[PDB]
RNA sequence: CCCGGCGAGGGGAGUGAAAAAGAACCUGAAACCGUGUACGUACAAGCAGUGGGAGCAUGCUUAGGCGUGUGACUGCGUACC
RNA sequence: UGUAACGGGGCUAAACCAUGCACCGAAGCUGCGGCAGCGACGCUUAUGCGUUGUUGGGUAGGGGAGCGUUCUGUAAGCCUGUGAAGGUGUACUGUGAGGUAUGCUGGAGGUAUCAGAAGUGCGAAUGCUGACAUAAGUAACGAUAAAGCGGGUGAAAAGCCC
């Protein structure tokens, strides 16, 4: 059932149901998005490429929500030499549930 | 999507006999290692001591190349004023056998709690007869 | 009901009289205030007479019995400290702390 | 501050921080490093800015309708009750009745009211213009006012 | 003489472990007159082993 | 106008003191100890979302090359086998499957087999 | 009124809006010291954290998982001025 | 002080030579998301950007923009005994200094906004004052002239009284 595929310079192997975060898509908080970008599925019988991507395969999923993650602080402080530095960031995900693996 | 780590309750632990008769010290001591550290298993963790109980008979037949049987010393000291002891590889095995391997596979263990844990793992004998039937250890080589 | 009772003020060290108070915790009342009798320190005494009021304490005011009755809580805290000029030689002095303990006992069932 | 120029202690053999005089600032009781002094925060503005500035003030309370300009303002006794009646008349309540002949029956009747100042139409000032929500100003005050700032 | 610098919370307690004292536990009862006391000392009254042995 | 200063200096040490809420004795008790600790602790954090990606590569590889090995090729082979038939799939997701479905991961094997 | 030595001190009673406003008296911080719970800890070496992370305890929901508390093992890591 | 001149285990290749091909390997480069400086540029417009190029380690030091504290005006306004300031948690929230909301404690003050002025921010100065630790229940308890017992008083007696 589970399916291989590459979304926000990076992959992710989901399976048909479950919730998936990934980093932020150009979408609306409750439209869908299509990933013809599938590396892999599998089943009984297992769809592997020989190629860039499979040749078919489409994974589509419904966007749930548009967050900001946890806030991580970012101390760089050089001993003796009266430097230091503090910065936030809260990096922006997109949460999107699998409604297809073709 | 976080990656999988092997629970301690959950992991599969193999028993395995290592017949050492003519076997190379280095590298049966490093195969020794690396299945003791469960590298060998496609679950591995860092963190947990994943690999399988090896027993190794006939350590006192272990093989050494060149004229290490008379040249390799193996020294430790007393912790005590000048108390500095050395013994050659031959006088190694004439003495305790066991100690030829116990002391090549704990230097390619990692050193730590985990380390001195997966030790534990490994059960070295002299002779060819082992007491440990009742786990049915399959063969390796 | 729990029914405190507790000297305040009292002239000993918390070190002292929490290393009397360790014996004493969850114990009978009988139980505990047999042992204080045949306890050979300063504090012993000093705990004792917090506790035999707290028993008298708890009968006449609150819950009555004394055979169900168990020390639940008992706890020294440190107390102000008096200073005191302790005069040393060659001219130097110290200041000595004259330390008090806040002794208290809870006898619950 | 009060207290001698003795060292507390020698410079030397004590293990104690080097002292110089008990009244310190870094020394508790006496000090303050830099102390205050009374000064004349009175800074100077131009001639020609103060009046720029009125003129500037003065024509938005035409922009923005406070300015209510009036003929004869002077009430018959000096009594606050009157005044306070009139100004109900009006829709007036928090007021600047500049005026230019100065009538003691009107002056005399605003000092207790404290929405209702009543200066003379020579002593109109920055603050006050900006300060009120009307400014209810006479037809002999207005051309005062003109002359005055030209 | 003198440490080089100061020791904790923790082993200040890990000392102390030992310092704690031990109860009796062993309270006697006298024969006729069922007082508790020592072992091998005599009552607040004045008897040891059911006998009256002093005023 | 004389400021005191004992509402602000509170706060800004109690904010401190609980980013310091774990640290054994003095470092979170103590604010001039726990503000070093606090620091290190920011320094570090800083430091080791950089090894996070380090370590997880090399326990990764570390899997792929257990399952490849127990299917008979070594993963210097087996990711050149990968390469040279424009496989995209990462470590991370190989020893994800490596570990859960070994049936699917053969035949990735033979997939580099090919090549 | 009670315990205690007609003690100190305390518990009740009563006064008060309030008595953790009881004269050591408004608020009552921190260091420091306890008592009680949860978890860890008696084959393990080092700026005591930080990445990773099992288990146990937990509140929730719910038949999803979380949030916390703790932190066995493990990669890296010699305070500040 | 101890093997102590491969980091170690251990190796006749796990050594050197030569050639090849893989592969690991950094905060380098790439990918994806986010922020900021600067130049352009279509010429937008008074700047958001189809962008477009590119920077963004930093001590002394220069330049830019901010947060927060007490005080003055806006304020005889606004918020507050249906709970102020303060204290103590929690939860959100901004790149940061911070901000907001609120449970408990508290029991009368607080203050938006945009301005104005500073005793305007502390970890160090063998800083200053108070409090409180540590060593530690450790050394010590001040002449090595000496106590002992019986009785008395007393809550209690080695020390007081006879
Ligand atoms: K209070
Ligand atoms: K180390
Ligand atoms: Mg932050
Ligand atoms: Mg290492
Ligand atoms: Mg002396
Ligand atoms: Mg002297
Ligand atoms: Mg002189
Ligand atoms: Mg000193
Ligand atoms: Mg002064
Ligand atoms: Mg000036
Ligand atoms: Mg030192
Ligand atoms: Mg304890
Ligand atoms: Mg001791
Ligand atoms: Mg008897
Ligand atoms: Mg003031
Ligand atoms: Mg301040
Ligand atoms: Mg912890
Ligand atoms: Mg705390
Ligand atoms: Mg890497
Ligand atoms: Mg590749
Ligand atoms: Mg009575
Ligand atoms: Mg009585
Ligand atoms: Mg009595
Ligand atoms: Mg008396
Ligand atoms: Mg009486
Ligand atoms: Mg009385
Ligand atoms: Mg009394
Ligand atoms: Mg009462
Ligand atoms: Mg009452
Ligand atoms: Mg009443
Ligand atoms: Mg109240
Ligand atoms: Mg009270
Ligand atoms: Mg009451
Ligand atoms: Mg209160
Ligand atoms: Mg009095
Ligand atoms: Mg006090
Ligand atoms: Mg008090
Ligand atoms: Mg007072
Ligand atoms: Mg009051
Ligand atoms: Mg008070
Ligand atoms: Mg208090
Ligand atoms: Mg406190
Ligand atoms: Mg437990
Ligand atoms: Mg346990
Ligand atoms: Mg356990
Ligand atoms: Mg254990
Ligand atoms: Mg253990
Ligand atoms: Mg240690
Ligand atoms: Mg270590
Ligand atoms: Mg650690
Ligand atoms: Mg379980
Ligand atoms: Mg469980
Ligand atoms: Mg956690
Ligand atoms: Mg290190
Ligand atoms: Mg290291
Ligand atoms: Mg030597
Ligand atoms: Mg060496
Ligand atoms: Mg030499
Ligand atoms: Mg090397
Ligand atoms: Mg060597
Ligand atoms: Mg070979
Ligand atoms: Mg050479
Ligand atoms: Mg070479
Ligand atoms: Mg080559
Ligand atoms: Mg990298
Ligand atoms: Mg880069
Ligand atoms: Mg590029
Ligand atoms: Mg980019
Ligand atoms: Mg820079
Ligand atoms: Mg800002
Ligand atoms: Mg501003
Ligand atoms: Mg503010
Ligand atoms: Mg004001
Ligand atoms: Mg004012
Ligand atoms: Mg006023
Ligand atoms: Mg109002
Ligand atoms: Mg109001
Ligand atoms: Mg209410
Ligand atoms: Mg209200
Ligand atoms: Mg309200
Ligand atoms: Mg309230
Ligand atoms: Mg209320
Ligand atoms: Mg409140
Ligand atoms: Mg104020
Ligand atoms: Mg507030
Ligand atoms: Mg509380
Ligand atoms: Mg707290
Ligand atoms: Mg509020
Ligand atoms: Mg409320
Ligand atoms: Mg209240
Ligand atoms: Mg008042
Ligand atoms: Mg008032
Ligand atoms: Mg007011
Ligand atoms: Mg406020
Ligand atoms: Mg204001
Ligand atoms: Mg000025
Ligand atoms: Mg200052
Ligand atoms: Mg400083
Ligand atoms: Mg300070
Ligand atoms: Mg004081
Ligand atoms: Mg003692
Ligand atoms: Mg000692
Ligand atoms: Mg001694
Ligand atoms: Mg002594
Ligand atoms: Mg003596
Ligand atoms: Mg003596
Ligand atoms: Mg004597
Ligand atoms: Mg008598
Ligand atoms: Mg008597
Ligand atoms: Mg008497
Ligand atoms: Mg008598
Ligand atoms: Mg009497
Ligand atoms: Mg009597
Ligand atoms: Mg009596
Ligand atoms: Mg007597
Ligand atoms: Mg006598
Ligand atoms: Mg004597
Ligand atoms: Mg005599
Ligand atoms: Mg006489």
Redesign the pocket.
Same mark, same amino acid.
Do not use: C
């Given at each position: 059932m589970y399916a291989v595929f590459?979304?926000?310079?990076?992959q992710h192997r989901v399976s048909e149901g479950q919730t998936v975060r990934?980093?932020?898509?150009?979408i609306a908080t409750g439209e869908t998005v299509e990933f013809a970008e599938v590396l892999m599925i599998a089943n009984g019988e297992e769809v592997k490429i020989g190629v860039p991507f499979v040749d078919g395969g489409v994974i589509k999923a419904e966007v749930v929500a548009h967050?900001?993650g946890?806030?991580?602080?970012?101390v760089?402080?050089?001993?003796?030499?009266?430097?230091?530095?503090?910065?936030?960031?809260?990096?922006?995900?997109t949460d999107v549930k699998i409604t297809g693996i073709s | 999507m976080?990656?999988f780590?092997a629970?301690?309750?959950?992991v599969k632990r193999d028993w395995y006999v290592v017949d050492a008769t003519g076997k190379?010290?280095?590298?049966?001591?490093?195969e020794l290692?690396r299945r003791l550290r469960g590298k060998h298993k496609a679950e591995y963790?860092?963190?947990?001591?994943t690999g399988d109980y090896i027993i190794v008979l006939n350590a006192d037949k272990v *093989? /050494?190349? $060149?004229?290490?049987r008379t040249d390799?010393?193996?020294?430790?000291?007393?912790?005590?004023?000048?108390?500095?002891k050395?013994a050659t590889f031959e006088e190694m095995i004439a003495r305790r056998p066991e100690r030829?391997?116990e002391? *090549? /596979?704990? $230097?390619?263990?990692?050193?730590?709690?985990?380390?001195?844990?997966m030790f534990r793992k490994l059960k070295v004998y002299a002779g060819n007869e082992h007491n440990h039937a009742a786990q049915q250890p399959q063969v390796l080589d | 009901m729990?029914?405190?009772?507790?000297?305040?003020?009292?002239?000993?060290?918390?070190?002292?009289v929490?290393?009397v108070?360790?014996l004493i915790?969850?114990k009978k009342v009988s139980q505990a205030l047999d042992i204080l009798t045949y306890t050979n320190k300063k504090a012993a005494v000093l705990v004792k007479?917090?506790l035999?009021?707290?028993?008298?304490?708890?009968?006449?005011?609150?819950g009555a019995d004394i055979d169900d009755l168990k020390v639940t809580?008992?706890?020294?805290?440190?107390?102000?400290?008096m200073?005191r000029i302790?005069?040393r030689a060659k001219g130097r002095a110290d200041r000595?702390?004259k330390?008090?303990s806040?002794?208290?006992v809870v006898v619950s069932d | 501050v009060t207290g001698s120029g003795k060292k507390?202690w020698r410079?030397?053999g004590?293990?104690?921080?080097?002292?110089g005089s008990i009244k310190?600032?870094?020394?508790?009781?006496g000090?303050?490093?830099?102390?205050?002094r009374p000064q004349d925060?009175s800074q100077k503005v131009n001639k020609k800015m103060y009046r720029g500035a009125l003129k500037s003030i003065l024509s938005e309370l035409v922009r923005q309708d406070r300015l209510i300009v009036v003929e004869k303002f002077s009430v018959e006794a000096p009594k606050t009750k009157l005044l306070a009646q009139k100004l109900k008349d009006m829709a007036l309540e928090?007021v600047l009745i500049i005026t230019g002949e100065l009538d003691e029956n009107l002056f005399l009747a605003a000092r207790?009211?404290?929405?209702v100042d009543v200066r003379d139409a020579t002593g109109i000032d920055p603050?006050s213009l900006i300060?009120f929500?009307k400014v209810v100003m006479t037809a002999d005050a207005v051309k005062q006012v003109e002359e005055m700032l030209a | 003489?003198?440490?080089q610098n100061?020791?904790?919370?923790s082993?200040?307690?890990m000392?102390?472990s030992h310092?704690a004292l031990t109860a009796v536990t062993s309270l006697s009862v006298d024969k006729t007159s069922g007082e508790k006391h020592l072992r091998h000392h005599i009552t607040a009254d004045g008897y040891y082993r059911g006998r009256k042995v002093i005023? | 106008?004389?400021?005191?200063?004992?509402?602000?200096?509170?706060?800004?040490?109690?904010?401190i003191?609980?980013?310091?809420?774990?640290?054994?004795?003095?470092?979170?008790?103590?604010?001039?100890?726990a503000?070093?600790?606090?620091?290190?602790?920011?320094?570090?954090?800083?430091?080791?979302?950089?090894?996070?990606?380090?370590?997880?590569?090399?326990?990764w590889?570390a899997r792929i090359n257990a399952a490849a090995r127990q299917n008979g090729i070594?993963?210097?082979?087996?990711?050149?086998?990968?390469?040279?038939a424009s496989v995209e799939i990462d470590?991370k997701i190989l020893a994800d499957i490596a570990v859960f479905d070994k049936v699917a991961f053969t035949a990735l094997v033979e997939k580099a087999k090919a090549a």
């Open positions: 590459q979304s926000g310079g990076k990934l980093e932020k898509l150009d967050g900001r946890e806030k991580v602080k970012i760089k402080f050089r001993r003796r030499k009266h430097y230091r530095k503090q910065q936030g960031h809260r990096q922006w995900f | 976080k990656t780590t629970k301690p309750e959950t190379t010290l280095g590298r049966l001591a490093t290692a963790t860092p963190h947990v001591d *093989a /050494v190349t $060149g004229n290490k390799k010393v193996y020294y430790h000291h007393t912790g005590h004023i000048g108390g500095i050395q030829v391997i002391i *090549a /596979v704990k $230097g390619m263990l990692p050193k730590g709690p985990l380390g001195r844990a | 729990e029914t405190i009772a507790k000297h305040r003020h009292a002239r000993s060290s918390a070190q002292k929490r290393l108070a360790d915790r969850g007479k917090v035999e009021s707290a028993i008298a304490n708890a009968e006449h005011n609150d809580k008992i706890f020294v805290d440190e107390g102000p400290s200073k302790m005069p000595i702390l330390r008090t806040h002794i208290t | 507390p410079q030397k004590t293990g104690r921080a080097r002292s310190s600032p870094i020394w508790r009781s000090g303050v490093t830099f102390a205050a925060h928090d207790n009211l404290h929405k603050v300060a929500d | 003489a003198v440490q100061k020791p904790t919370r082993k200040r307690g000392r102390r310092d005023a | 106008a004389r400021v005191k200063r004992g509402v602000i200096a509170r706060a800004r040490h109690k904010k003191l609980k980013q310091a809420k774990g640290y054994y004795g003095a470092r979170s008790r103590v604010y001039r100890v503000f070093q600790a606090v620091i290190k602790a920011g320094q570090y954090a800083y430091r080791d979302r950089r090894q996070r990606k380090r370590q997880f590569r090399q326990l590889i070594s993963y210097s082979k087996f990711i050149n086998g990968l390469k040279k470590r």
